Structure formats: structure tokens, C-alpha cells
User: Which sequence fits this backbone?
């Protein structure tokens, strides 16, 4: 096959993407060993769905797992009556998700389970895939002539040829695995044929962070979770928290081999020690550095010029309300709270009005990083930790370090009941989720 | 003094730059040895004059040389009755140049002798300095916060503590020297204090070319000879032919020492050999690589973003005439021709009309590179060698390799008699110059 493994793509045909997926335990070869994973479509990652605005998606999910499951269309501003976080598909049953892709949309999205209390083991076991909304902007020459690749960043740990079970400490920290994979492959080689790459990046890990840096190169950020930036932004490294996506251009500068690495990053995960008195929680400290892939540049590379502009960011109406959502932890209990409460699917926490704009101030009063996710309603990050964000783009996950406040501008789009939650999915399963109702 | 030597600057005061310079033989220390040079203002290079649009310049040149001399205000679109290539200032006499800096002007210019038949030894001996027209564009933050430096690139050879005399081969090739200097200094160190540098580059050499490359970095071209580009242009190297200027931004990428080099370049200079039959002319081949300066980056450099735009290039009226000027050589005679003739100050070669636009096709039918210069009327290079130029900017020198045609758009500005000539100044002295009259 290709040097660079990527999930097989399913494209809409004549404006319709009609597909039956099964969620199933699946023997496969991964990272050179046999294992049984839980997969969509028989593969890990699941197939990449590639659509355009105004396409119809008709996805029938057949549940062949021994437990109930459902799908969250992560990042898509569609109705929560379709992207329904409360729906349960029992074992052996099927459900058809049907929606129209919004007109004003572009970027990399993804799909995964969202059945409260079961997300973390289902996602860890292999249930996830990408969705790409292709744009008329992809025809500008500076993007069309780039070599495009999707990188699904997701780690795994195997025990007995199956995903390793969750321990108590995994429920507290979020589970990370020792196999740090790209598109299900261990440290693949990307032999570039063009001097400009356009990389779609997805962090589909339960809890692992990827502090991305390409040796000897900057990255040019051109899209965040839910859409393009207004113009490319040069960065020396890019932190992708669980659930985040980004698209970057890479402008290869000379022949050679360059490592794409996940550089050491301390997200506040905790261990336990006993030193005589004790036992007490102690910080795990930074992650060990990981090589994600080997990038081989072509001979005599001469990258394209960068595009001068991408997409203008919408002018939003003035906001009508300011919310404040405070995140806290009880680590030894592995319990996690928003404004002092755990999730209750019967309780509405916030009630807002469709087509108004809200300011949400999300404050992390814990010691771990928490990546905050809001379904259905993409947002503009104004500032985090008191620092203004350096670009305007739609996001749907924002990472908060310990102590930091994020200020978000949140246009409320579709009516209905939806959720917001930490995207360290163990923390959502353990209570860090609340209910927004839009009317 | 500073780590980085630069010529002392004289600024206009209250809109007036009024200065008396003397052209004089001057004992000085240069490159660690004593020598007597010919200088303006007692220094090598001469002082940098720094003015703004609509300033008055009143420059009295006192000739203290044993031969006549004059000044050419290289690149300034002023009247040829001021920038007068036929004027002679006898030994011991003085002349006052007085002009107003044009409103729509910015960049790096320079001044040097232009007395036909004596330019090459006078310029080689040290008579040159820079003129900077500062712009309201210099206040945009991406330029204002950059560290600015002028680099006058000019080589020298010394014999007996004086500039080495011209040999016959020097008149054929143009004279190059073994001391390859920046601002009169041998391989200075530039210890950068900011992460973004704005370097004004001037090739004031008689004949040496500088194929410029900074180790491990691109250069961002922001101005050509006579004005800004429309937006910055990333280049991996930049060839500066005699008389050319450029301004580049340098975005320092990491701590360390980086060489600015003049990389090997073959301009077609010729030597002589005798191998049994013979003696016959033989190519000298490429120049040896030279280190121009050592650039030390600061700690933890974080360059500014590049400016998105600089200056829009004027929309020019449609042209009313196409000229064709063919350059040829008689190397063994050291004679050089345009359309088959040598310069004659009494003969008008071209007659054009003020405020019309002309297309000039300049064709190098020789084997050497020839950098073609037009006084008084800056031009837009459309293409050279059949390749479209990748930016729009005012130029006044265009380099032609052997066989190449340059197509130039030439708006005729001030009325009067002026000249065009090769800026390998030995070739101008030996006849490669003609007369344009604008009415
Ligand atoms: Cu998600
Ligand atoms: Cu969390
Ligand atoms: Cu969710
Ligand atoms: Cu000149
Ligand atoms: Cu010439
Ligand atoms: Cu001249
Ligand atoms: Na299957
Ligand atoms: Na003097």
C-alpha cells in the first residue's frame, strides 16, 4: 500500500452520503500485533466521510456491541434532535442519522460514541472516525496544489490482545496508552511528493495531549476545530487537546528526514506515592517525548506561496448574556463538577435563546488541564488565561490550564437540549457535563 | 564603537539637508591597514544622507581631486539638469546640487562620480555613499519595530597603500578586488538585538556581483532599487548586480551564528591562457565564495509577523513606443556597444516624450552579464530572459545574463538629456552608454 496509511474515504455521491456502519468487535492487525478492537466499518480508525455543504448524510449505525451506544457528530452545528446525546441504541438495534450539511461550513470533524458513563471505554477501544467538509476554498491554487493528508492522533494500550481495561487512576486522569499511533499505524513514514503539505490533524485520544512540532520547521495554521482562520498563522508548535482539530500547511525547506514529534507536556495527571508518611497524590509531570511520524522531504523542494487570505470570520451580533461555568475536581473520588454539580440528564443547567450571542466565561479551578467542549453551537475563543487569542475561527473545544479563564463568544444556533462537557472523556463519564436548552 | 560599523548619517533638518562635501584623497585605516582612498566627507563609504519626500537637498561638492569629477544621484527621478551626467567640476572648483525630493518616493539610493572615462578609477578608489528616502510606510509596526541596518557592499584591492591601478584586463572585465567589505569593514559581526532585521543592501562595487544567502534563512524582499514591492516576497537567495539596491527583512529563527555569504556566481569574466597554440580568452568561471558578515541571533528570537502589504504599484498608462537596445562586446579591444555604437556625448540616440510610457527591450548579445542602468526615469521590469518578474517595484538597474532580453516599462518623467549605460562602470567608460532626450 502507500507509505502513509490513511483511513479509507467514503464520498457523497450526487449530494447524498448514504452508508450503513456497524459498531463491532473486530480482529485486526495493528502496530504489528493482532488485537480485537471495537470499530466502525471494520477498521481503526473508522472510514473518513467526505462531504460538501448542503449534502444529505444518511448514516445507519448498527450496534453490534454488547452494550448500548450512540454517535456524536462532533463539531457539526446541526440539530440536537439528530446529534442527540441522550439517545441509546441497544445491542443489536440500528438507528439512522439523517441531516443536511450546513451551507457555511468547512473543516475536519469527527464521530464517536456519546452514551454517558460508557464513552471512555468505547472510544478507547477504537470507536472513532473523521468527517471532512470540503470547501470551495480548497480550489484556490495555494491549497489545491498542496499534498493533503489526514492525521488521526490516537493512542492505545493492549492487554491480552484487547484494549487494556480502565483502572481507578485512569478514571481520575483519563487513560493514555503506550502505543502512540497515527491513523492506527506506529510511527509511519510520510514520503512527501510535493513541497507543500496540507495536514488535517485530529486528536481522537481519550486524554493524551499532542504538543506538536516538526523538526526544523514552523507550522502554518489555516483552520481550527470548526473552520478556517482568516489568514494563515505561523506557529512554532501546536498543542492539540483531546477532541481538537487543526489544519496546517507545512512548507518543506530542504531535502531530508524530519521528525513530527509530540513534545513533553504536563497536563496535570497525578500518581500516588508513599514515602514514609503518606500515601499522597503526586504530579506525574510532563509526558515523555514521542515521535509521531517520519516526514521525508522531496528533492529540491520549492513550496508554494502561502494563501494571503482564507475565510473572513463572521461579524457577530452583540451578546445578550454572560455565563460563568466553574470547573472543579475531587481527584481521589474521581469526581468532576461544573458550578459545583455533576451531570444529571433530567436537569437543565442553562437556558438560552436561539440566534442570540452569549459570552461564556469558563474557569478551570482544578489543577489538571480540562478541554471544554460544547455540542451543536461552535464558538469564537476571545481569550484564555487573560491572553487574547491570535486568530478568529470557529472552535468547539477549548483547553484550559489550571487556573485559566476562557472567554468564549457563543452564537446559539439550533433549538433543543444539548450538552457541554470536558473532553477528557473519563471526566465526562464521571460527571463533568451539563445541559443547555436553547429555545 | 558598535559591533556593526555603518556610515555616519546626515539627516535633513526642518525639511532642508544643506551639506558641503569634499571629494579628497584621505589617509584612513581600512580592513586593518592604512591606506589613502578617495573619499567624500573624509570617510569610506561617504556619509549616508537621510531625507524625506519634499525635503530640499542642497549639496555643495568641492572637488579636491587632481582630476575633474561630478555626482550622479543614482536612482533619483529628478531633473537631468541637476543630475547632470555631462557636467564637469574641475580640480579645486565646487558645484551646488539643489533639488526637491519627489513626493512619491521611498527606498535606498546612492551617489557616486559620473564623469565619462573616469568613473571606474574614481568609484574604485572609494567615492560613493548612500541616500535613504524615509517613508510613512516605515511607521507601520512590522517595520518600525525591526532593527534597521545599511549594508554597503563594495570590494577593494590595495597596492602600495593606495587603490590598485586598473590593468587592461580590468577594463575588459570590470575590476574586482580581494578585500570584500561591508561598510568598509572586513567581515564585521552584526550582533542582532531584535529578532527581525530590516537590511538596506547596496552593491556599490565596480563589477563584483553578490549572490546573497544567509545560512539557514530565507530573505523577505520588501524593496527593489527604487521603491517598495507591493507585498513581501520570500526568496532563498538574492543576486545584487553592480548599482542595484534591495531591502530585505530577516526573521531570525533560533539562537546562533549565521554567515551572510556571497555565493559562487559566474558573470562571464574572462582570462587568457596559452596551452601550446593559443593565446586565447578563457572563462574565469564562478567567483569564490565570500563571507560578508557574521550575524549573531539574540536569545529566544520571536520575529514580528511580516507586513501583509507594502505599497501598491502605480497603474501605468498604455505605452506609445517600443525600443530595442542590443548590447554587444569586443572583449579583446575592451570595447562595448549599444546598437552597434559607442557613446558620443554629442549624439542623441533616443528621443521620447515626457509623461508617456515606453517599452524598452534590452538584449544582451554578449557573453558577460551586463547590468543596464537608465538615469532619471525608473522603470518596471516586466520580464527577463522570457521569465515574468515575480513582483512589481521601481528599478533603475536590471541585470542581463548572456543572451537574455529584458522587457521594461519606462515612464518618461523629467524633460532633458540623460544617459543609459552598463553599470559595470569600466564598460561605460569604454563606451557602453547612449543618450536619451525627453521633450
Ligand atoms: Cu467529541
Ligand atoms: Cu476534564
Ligand atoms: Cu459530547
Ligand atoms: Cu550608479
Ligand atoms: Cu557591461
Ligand atoms: Cu550613469
Ligand atoms: Na464490522
Ligand atoms: Na575630506
Assistant:
Amino acid at each position: 500500500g502507500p507509505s502513509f496509511p490513511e483511513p479509507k474515504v467514503v464520498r457523497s455521491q450526487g449530494g447524498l452520503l448514504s452508508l450503513k456502519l456497524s459498531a463491532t468487535p473486530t480482529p485486526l492487525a495493528i502496530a504489528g500485533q493482532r488485537a480485537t478492537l471495537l470499530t466502525y466499518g471494520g477498521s481503526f480508525p473508522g472510514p473518513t466521510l467526505r462531504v460538501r455543504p448542503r449534502d444529505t448524510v444518511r448514516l445507519t449505525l448498527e450496534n453490534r456491541l454488547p452494550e448500548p451506544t450512540n454517535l456524536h457528530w462532533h463539531g457539526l452545528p446541526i440539530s440536537p434532535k439528530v446529534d442527540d446525546p441522550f439517545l441509546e441504541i441497544p445491542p443489536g438495534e440500528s438507528w439512522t442519522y439523517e441531516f443536511t450539511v450546513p451551507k457555511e461550513l468547512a473543516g475536519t470533524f469527527w464521530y464517536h460514541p456519546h452514551l454517558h458513563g460508557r464513552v471512555a471505554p468505547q472510544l478507547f477501544a477504537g470507536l472513532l472516525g473523521a468527517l471532512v467538509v470540503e470547501s470551495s476554498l480548497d480550489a484556490i491554487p495555494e491549497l489545491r496544489e498542496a499534498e493533503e493528508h489526514l492525521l488521526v492522533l490516537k493512542d492505545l494500550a493492549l492487554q491480552g490482545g484487547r484494549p487494556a481495561p480502565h483502572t481507578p487512576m485512569d478514571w481520575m486522569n483519563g487513560k493514555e496508552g503506550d502505543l502512540v499511533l497515527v491513523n492506527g499505524a506506529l510511527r509511519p513514514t510520510l514520503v512527501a511528493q510535493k513541497a507543500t503539505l496540507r495536514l488535517r490533524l485530529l486528536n481522537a485520544s481519550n486524554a493524551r495531549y499532542y504538543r506538536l512540532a516538526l523538526q526544523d520547521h514552523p507550522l502554518y495554521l489555516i483552520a481550527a476545530d470548526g473552520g478556517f482562520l482568516e489568514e494563515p498563522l505561523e506557529v512554532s508548535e501546536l498543542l492539540l487537546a483531546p477532541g481538537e482539530r487543526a489544519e496546517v500547511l507545512v512548507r518543506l525547506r530542504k531535502e531530508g528526514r524530519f521528525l513530527l514529534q509530540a513534545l513533553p507536556y504536563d497536563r496535570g495527571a497525578m500518581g500516588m506515592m508513599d514515602m514514609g508518611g503518606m500515601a499522597h497524590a503526586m504530579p506525574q509531570g510532563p509526558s515523555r517525548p514521542e515521535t509521531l511520524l517520519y516526514l521525508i522531504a522531496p528533492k529540491n523542494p520549492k513550496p508554494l506561496p502561502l494563501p494571503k487570505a482564507l475565510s473572513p470570520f463572521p461579524t457577530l451580533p452583540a451578546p445578550v448574556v454572560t455565563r460563568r461555568l466553574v470547573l472543579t475536581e475531587d481527584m481521589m473520588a474521581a469526581r468532576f463538577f461544573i458550578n459545583g454539580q455533576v451531570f444529571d440528564h433530567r436537569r437543565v443547567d442553562l437556558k438560552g435563546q436561539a440566534q442570540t450571542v452569549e459570552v461564556w466565561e469558563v474557569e478551570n479551578q482544578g489543577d489538571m488541564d480540562h478541554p471544554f467542549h460544547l455540542h451543536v453551537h461552535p464558538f469564537q475563543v476571545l481569550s484564555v488565561g487573560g491572553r487574547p487569542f491570535p486568530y478568529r475561527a470557529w472552535k468547539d473545544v477549548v483547553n484550559l490550564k489550571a487556573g485559566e479563564v476562557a472567554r468564549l463568544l457563543v452564537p446559539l444556533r439550533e433549538k433543543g437540549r444539548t450538552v457541554f462537557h470536558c473532553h477528557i472523556v473519563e471526566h465526562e463519564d464521571r460527571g463533568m457535563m451539563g445541559v443547555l436548552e436553547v429555545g
Chain B is about 5% helix and 45% strand.
